[PDB]
């Protein structure tokens, strides 16, 4: 019957602050992301979060992955179970498939896929299998109607993925594993 | 002075006559230099001789900057050993790469 | 990190330096890698010289402060080659880079402000 | 506790494993001249894990 | 079809007979040592002189060439013409030459073998009449000038088209091209037939076996993309792994372990298939180095299994044979090794098998759990099996020690399993 | 000496214009900006080259 | 010649002779397969 919530905030230099909100704003810890020259998005995933959210207090879990996507296209990716113990950690991986500014990160409700998607150019979405930290190779293909991806939303239950672009046309896919 | 010079100069260093004649005449510059008689350039074959001369010159400049400017020098040459490992791997891969059709 | 890497820029100065390195990359006024940096020093066209203080071994860019000193060009050490390579905007680690001289750019005021800060730090 | 939390225990317990990709074994052909088979097995396992 | 095509087949039928002096000069001019001029000059008495001398040397080095001294290296074999005998005698002559090539495959860094096979080449015309076994036997030497000479002589078969590009050039054929040659499928059927014959005649060696396991690993790596090409690569490579494991040599057993580990980390295989491979490994496991390699590959197969029923108990006969080949001190040394290769799923299945079957080595179980950091679902399954065994079997102090250890480390999971079953 | 200096300055400016034209040849997404003084410059799209 | 009439060494050959699909699909693991995505458009 008790949890406690933590706020993570990332500077443009790569310095990461972690406050807790139950007792008042008091910095639990600080650390630094490796590389990360201009960091534009951070996301946590693999447990419960503000996208695949909890439905009763007993169903709150602790997140495992923490992905940090920067302006150059690079997405560092951390395991929390080692990062919280190492206190200036080394990433599990550093993905570099995309080349423009990372403007969307979205974990699965489970945390097995990481969807990283830019905004500055067409056809700029890649899915990543975790903990392998490896980009899926057969989707999207060169004839996938993605557009300039500005919104990505995973479904909590049915295994859908919804992508919305600049032309104003969202588009559904269903993952057949789930 | 040899450590202060960059890597492309260490590649070119021997063939200065043909270098400056080609520069002032707007022709193609020589590619080997004095590094032709090193063993790796002696094992490569043609365009691989050019590419291995470039890679070996880069690694030689790395080693030179280490040795001329080391304060606690091991005098066992592990930097040179690893640069030779990288150059040997690069050369064997570039020889395994084939031009013709199979 | 490495005590032979003497002028080691802090968080605010390194943030200013990596911002001006990003602007210089997108203007294409930036020569990357230690050999091209040494070439810029020999030609005499560098505004200033950025190095990475965690290259192992450190001597392969320790050759550069001597020419920078003898030709009166500012140099500084930012603390990560990975972050420096991402600032210069290439998919590798880059241990040294140089902002080159052209007095008609649209980033000249930023380059001169950072260059003055580096001059103060070396002084 | 729930059966979904059992499944989440399975998923979160699963650890990473390095995949094989189309150019991961060429150094074997390089240094396979006069090595012994135990050393070759150790080299293959070190590339895998 | 066309007249030039039917005549082409007629020519390749009569490819070897010397119907005229010009064809005779060409056919007798192709040679392994001597060049064109001297090879067209000399004669069968000269070649046979060198052959008998070199075969005396080869029989002195390795004593199995006496039978070829009886049959393929006799004066009646100077006299007999291959192109005149009937098909039955042709077949027996081909068996003799194939057996010789299997024996003298492992000795090709030697002027004696070069001279003996010079006599075979320039009397029995192996280099056009049966070149398949010639190339397969001397395929592992592929940088060497002997292979360069063999290539410059041979008219290449259908399957060796990459070498048909590399024939009569200056550089050796490269490793990527050998990867092409093995990456065809009918070639792999042919080569696994060759190795099965080679094992059944019991003449393998470390260089050739290294070469063939390296080409097999590179074939699997090149076809890592296609789930379908891997799925049709399965029966060939796992049949040759079965025969290579049924062999007696520790070298063959380690090479089969290498093929097995790479193919099972490239393709997520069925549970029964993995357990059958483990059963053959343990059923023929004899030597010590092969024992080390077999433990490593069994851990790797049980780990790369990822699915349903992932971590269940080892069955009866498999657990019996596994303990008989690896008693507990060996696996405990493997676990307190400092390299620490990951083996948690195999360990968990091992402890569940001990808990159901043996019901004695529970202190050994405690030492295993003290040396290994298991995962959460594995700890849950071990605890559930121990709860069932405590409720069925009579309570014992070693079981009390195990539960005390759990309550020391991770008591609330034990509370959760008791809440699932009990008070 | 003054003539030496003037010749070297003229050559430096020539090489700068030549290097700009060389940069307009490789790759990337250039944008042809005109400075409202009337002078042409180029600006590349922010995208990490590989 | 042929007439069909301790763990053995013919187990792998017998298993390969029985089955025709090797890469298992009836796992249904609640894991996700790497490098090959099963996705449909909607």
Q: In what helix (H) or strand (E) does residue E301 lie, and over which residues does it extend? A: helix E288-304
Structure tokens at E356: 């159901």
Residue A131: asked if its preceding bond is cis (omega within 30°), the reply is yes
Are the C-beta atoms of B64 and B57 separated by less than 8 Å? no
Q: Does domain C1-123 have CATH number 3.10.20.80?
A: no
Resolution in Å equals: 3.8
D and C adjacent (3 or more CB pairs under 8 angstroms): no
No. of helices (H) and no. of strands (E), chain B: 5, 0
**H or E element that contains A129:** strand A125-129
Distance CA E270, CA E265 (A): 12
Smallest Cα distance from C107 to chain B, Å: 29
Nearest to E298 by CA among E350, E220, E222, E359: E350
Q: Which element (helix H / strand E) includes E260?
A: helix E250-266
Question: Distance (Å, rounded) from C-alpha E181 to C-alpha E139?
Answer: 11
**Longest Cα–Cα distance in chain G:** 60
Phi, psi of G29 (to 5 degrees): -80, -25
DSSP string for residues in E5-23: HHHHHHHHHTSS---SHHH
SS3 E364: helix
Q: What is the DSSP letter of E173?
A: P
Sheet with strand A39-45: strands edge to edge: A39-45, A65-70, A75-79, A93-95
Query: CA G14, E211, E196 angle in degrees (round to 5)?
Result: 35
> Helices E328-335 & E288-304, crossing angle to 10 degrees?
70
Beta strands in G1-42 (DSSP E): 39-41
Largest Cα–Cα separation, chain E: 102
| Interchain CB contact of B58 with C (< 8 Å) | yes
Structural element, H or E, at residue B9: helix B7-12
Distance CA E242, CA E234 (A): 12
**Under a CB-based contact definition with an 8 Å cutoff, are residues E179 and E222 in contact?**
yes
- The answer to whether G22 contacts E318, with C-beta atoms less than 8 Å apart, is no
CA E161: distance to chain centroid?
A: 24
Q: Looking at chain B, which residue has its C-alpha nearest residue C68?
A: B4
The residue ranges of DSSP E strands in chain F, in sequence order, are 30-35, 39-44
Q: Are 3 or more Cβ–Cβ pairs between F and G shorter than 8 Å? A: no
For residue G35, list chain D residues with Cβ-Cβ distance below 8 A.
19
Helix axis angle for E250-266 and E288-304, nearest 10°, is 10
Question: In the structure encoding, which two tokens stand for residue E296, read together?
Answer: 């490593």
Q: What is d(CA G30, CA D15) in angstroms, rounded to the nearest whole number?
A: 14
List C-alpha distances in Å: A92 to A6, A75, A81: 22, 11, 11
User: For residue F49, which residues of chain A lie inside 8 Å, CB to CB?
Assistant: 99
Choose, out of B44, B93, B94, B98, the residue to mutate when testing the contact with E (most E CBs < 10 Å).
B98
> What DSSP designation does A134 have?
E
Query: For E356, which DSSP code?
Result: I
The tokens for E199 are 């094992």
Q: Which residues of D touch A132 (CB under 8 A)?
A: 16-17, 19
Provide the 10 A C-beta neighbour count for residue E49.
12
CA A35 to each of CA A72, A82, A102, C24, E402: distance values in angstroms, whole numbers, following the listed order: 11, 18, 15, 19, 46
Comparing alpha-carbon positions, the chain B residue that sits nearest to C58 is B66
Three-class DSSP category at B86: helix
Determine whether A6 is exposed, middle or buried from the number of CB atoms within 10 Å of its CB (0-12, 13-18, 19+).
Answer: middle
Instruction: For residue C94, count CB atoms less than 10 angstroms from its CB and return exposed for 0-12, middle for 13-18, buried for 19 or more.
Output: buried
**By the CB < 8 Å criterion, does D33 face chain B?**
no
SS (H, E, C) chain C: CCCCCCCECCHHHHHHHHHHHHHHHHHCCEEECHHHHHHHHHHCCEEEEEEECCCCCCHHHHCHHHHHHHCCCCEEEECCHHHHHHHHCECCCCCEEEEECCCCCCCHHHHHHHHHHHHHHHC
Q: What is the DSSP letter of F20?
A: H
Work out the number of other CB atoms within 10 angstroms of the CB of residue F33: 12
Is D40 part of the contact surface with chain E (CB cutoff 8 Å)? Answer: yes
In b/e form, how buried is each residue of E62-75, taking b as 16+ CB within 10 angstroms? eeebeebeeebbee
Q: Where are the domains of chain C?
A: 1-123
Residues C29/C107, Cβ–Cβ less than 8 Å: yes
Task: Check: CB of residue E252 under 8 Å from CB of residue E209.
Answer: yes
Contact E175 B97 (CB under 8 A): no
8 Å CB contact between E236 and E216? no
Q: Please tell me the distance from the alpha carbon of residue E94 to that of residue E85, in angstroms, as a whole number.
A: 12
Is D27 in the B-facing interface, judged by CB distances under 8 Å? Answer: yes
With a CB-CB cutoff of 8 Å, which residues 58-97 of chain A face chain C?
70, 72, 74, 96
Does C35 touch chain B if contact means CB atoms closer than 8 Å? yes
The whole-angstrom separation of Cα D17 and Cα E265 is: 9
Distance between CA A44 and CA A68 in Å, rounded? 9
Cβ pair C48, C74 in contact under 8 A: yes
Contact B65 C38 (CB under 8 A): no
What radius of gyration, in Å, describes the C-alpha atoms of chain F? 15
Structure tokens given for A2: 């008790």
Are the beta carbons of E59 and E65 closer than 8 angstroms?
Answer: yes
B6/E421 Cα distance (integer angstroms):
74
Closest partner residue to C18 among A37, A74, A96, by Cβ?
A37
Cβ–Cβ under 8 Å, residues E197 and E168: no
Q: Is the dihedral of CA D26, D31, D35, D41 positive or negative?
A: negative
Tokens representing A45? 């995933």
Vertex E369, ends E276 and E417: CA angle to 5°?
A: 90
Mention every residue, 6+ apart, whose C-beta is less than 8 A from residue E233: E185, E188, E219, E220, E223, E263
CB A116, CB A100: distance < 8 Å: no
Q: Is B85 on the interface with C (CB under 8 A)?
A: no
Cα E95 to the center of its chain, rounded Å: 24
Tokens linked to C44? 């005499």
For residue A55, what are its two tokens? 């439905």
SS (H, E, C) B63-81: HHHHHHCCCCCCCCCHHHH
Give me the count of residues in chain A: 178
SS3 label, residue G23: coil
How many of the other CB atoms lie within 10 Å of CB of B44?
19
CB contact under 8 A, D19 and G35: yes
Distance CA E274, CA E264 (A): 8
Question: Where do breaks (C to N over 2.5 Å) occur in chain E, by preceding residue number?
Answer: none
Q: How far is CA E127 from CA E9, E62, E156, E197, in A?
A: 19, 24, 9, 21
């Amino acid at each position: 019957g008790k949890f406690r919530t933590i706020l993570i905030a990332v500077n443009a230099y790569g310095e990461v602050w972690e406050f807790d909100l139950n007792k008042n704003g008091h910095v639990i810890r600080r650390w630094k992301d490796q590389g990360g020259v201009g960091i534009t998005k951070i996301q946590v995933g693999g447990g419960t979060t503000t996208t695949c959210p909890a439905l009763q207090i007993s169903k709150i879990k602790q997140n495992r992955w923490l992905a940090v996507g920067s302006e150059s296209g690079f997405v560092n990716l951390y395991d929390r179970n080692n990062a919280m113990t190492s206190s200036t950690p080394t990433p599990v991986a550093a993905l570099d498939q995309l080349t423009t500014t990372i403007s969307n990160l979205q974990f699965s409700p489970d945390g097995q896929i990481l969807c990283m998607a830019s905004r500055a150019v067409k056809d700029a979405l890649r899915l990543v299998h975790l903990p392998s930290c490896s980009v899926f190779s057969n989707w999207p293909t060169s004839g996938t109607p993605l557009g300039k991806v500005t919104s990505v939303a995973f479904s909590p239950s049915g295994g859908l993925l919804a992508v919305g672009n600049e032309q104003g046309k969202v588009r559904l896919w269903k993952l057949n594993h789930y | 002075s040899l450590a202060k010079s960059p890597a492309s100069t260490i590649q070119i260093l021997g063939a200065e006559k043909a270098l400056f004649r080609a520069l002032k005449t707007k022709h193609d510059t020589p590619k080997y230099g004095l590094l032709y008689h090193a063993s790796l350039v002696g094992q490569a074959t043609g365009k691989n001789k050019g590419k291995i001369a470039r890679v070996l010159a880069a690694k030689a400049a790395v080693s030179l900057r280490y040795d001329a400017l080391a304060e606690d020098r091991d005098d066992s040459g592990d930097i040179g050993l690893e640069s030779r490992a990288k150059v040997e791997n690069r050369l064997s891969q570039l020889e395994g790469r084939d031009l013709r059709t199979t | 990190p490495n005590p032979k890497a003497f002028p080691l820029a802090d968080a605010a100065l390194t943030q200013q330096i990596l911002d001006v390195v990003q602007q210089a990359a997108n203007l294409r006024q930036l020569k990357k890698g230690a050999n091209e940096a040494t070439k810029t020093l020999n030609r005499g066209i560098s505004e200033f010289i950025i190095m990475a203080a965690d290259c192992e071994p450190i001597e392969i860019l320790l050759h550069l402060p001597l020419l920078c000193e003898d030709k009166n060009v500012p140099y500084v050490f930012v603390p990560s080659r990975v972050a420096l390579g991402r600032a210069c905007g290439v998919s590798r680690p880059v241990i040294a880079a140089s902002i080159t001289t052209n007095d008609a750019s649209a980033i000249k005021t930023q380059i001169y402000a950072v260059k003055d800060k580096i001059e103060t730090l070396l002084i | 506790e729930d059966e979904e939390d059992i499944a989440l225990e399975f998923i979160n317990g699963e650890k990473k494993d390095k995949l094989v990709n189309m150019n991961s074994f060429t150094s074997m052909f390089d240094n396979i001249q006069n090595v012994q088979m135990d050393t070759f097995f150790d080299r293959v396992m070190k590339v895998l894990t | 079809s066309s007249l030039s095509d039917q005549l082409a087949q007629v020519a390749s039928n009569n490819a070897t007979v010397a119907l005229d002096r010009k064809r005779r000069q060409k056919l007798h001019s192709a040679s392994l040592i001597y060049n064109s001029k001297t090879a067209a000059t000399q004669d069968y008495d000269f070649i046979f002189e060198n052959a008998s001398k070199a075969l005396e040397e080869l029989s002195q080095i390795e004593p199995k060439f006496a039978i070829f001294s009886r049959t393929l290296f006799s004066e009646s074999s100077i006299s007999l013409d291959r192109n005149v005998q009937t098909k039955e005698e042709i077949k027996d002559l081909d068996n003799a030459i194939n057996a010789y090539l299997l024996l003298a495959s492992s000795k090709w860094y030697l002027a004696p073998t070069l001279h003996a096979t010079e006599w075979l080449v320039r009397r029995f015309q192996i280099h056009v009449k049966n070149t398949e076994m010639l190339l397969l036997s001397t395929l592992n030497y592929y940088q060497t000038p002997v292979f360069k000479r063999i290539l410059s002589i041979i008219k290449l078969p259908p399957l060796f088209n990459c070498l048909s590009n590399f024939v009569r050039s200056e550089k050796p054929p490269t490793a990527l091209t050998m990867i092409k040659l093995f990456n065809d499928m009918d070639f792999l059927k042919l080569y696994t037939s060759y190795l099965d014959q080679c094992i059944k005649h019991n003449a393998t060696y470390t260089n050739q076996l290294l070469f063939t396991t390296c080409c097999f690993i590179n074939v699997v790596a090149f076809n890592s993309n296609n789930d379908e090409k891997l799925n049709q690569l399965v029966p060939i490579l796992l049949e040759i792994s079965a025969k290579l494991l049924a062999s007696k040599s520790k070298d063959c057993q380690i090479a089969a372990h290498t093929i097995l580990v790479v193919f099972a980390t490239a393709l997520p295989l069925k549970k029964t298939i993995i357990l059958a491979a483990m059963e053959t490994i343990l059923s023929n496991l004899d030597a010590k180095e092969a024992k080390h390699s077999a433990l490593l590959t069994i851990c790797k197969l049980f780990q790369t299994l990822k699915g349903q029923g992932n971590v269940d108990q080892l069955p009866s006969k498999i657990f019996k044979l596994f303990d008989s080949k690896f008693d507990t001190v060996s696996i405990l040394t493997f676990l307190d090794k400092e390299d620490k290769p990951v083996c948690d799923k195999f360990i968990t299945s091992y402890t569940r098998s001990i808990a159901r079957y043996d019901r004695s080595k529970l202190n050994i179980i405690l030492s295993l759990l003290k040396k290994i950091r298991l995962e959460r679902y594995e700890v849950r399954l071990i605890i559930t099996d121990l709860i069932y065994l405590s409720e069925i079997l009579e309570d014992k102090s070693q079981l009390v020690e195990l539960f005390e250890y759990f309550i020391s480390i991770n008591e609330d999971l034990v509370l959760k399993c008791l809440k699932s079953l009990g008070l | 000496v003054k003539q030496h200096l003037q010749r070297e300055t003229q050559l430096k400016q020539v090489q700068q214009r030549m290097d700009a034209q060389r940069e307009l040849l490789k790759k990337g997404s250039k944008k042809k900006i005109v400075d409202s003084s009337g002078k042409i410059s180029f600006k590349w799209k922010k995208q990490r080259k590989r | 010649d042929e007439s069909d009439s301790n763990g053995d060494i013919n187990a792998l050959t017998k298993i390969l002779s029985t089955t025709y699909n090797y890469k298992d699909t009836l796992s249904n693991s609640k894991l996700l397969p790497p490098k090959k995505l099963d996705i449909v458009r909607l």
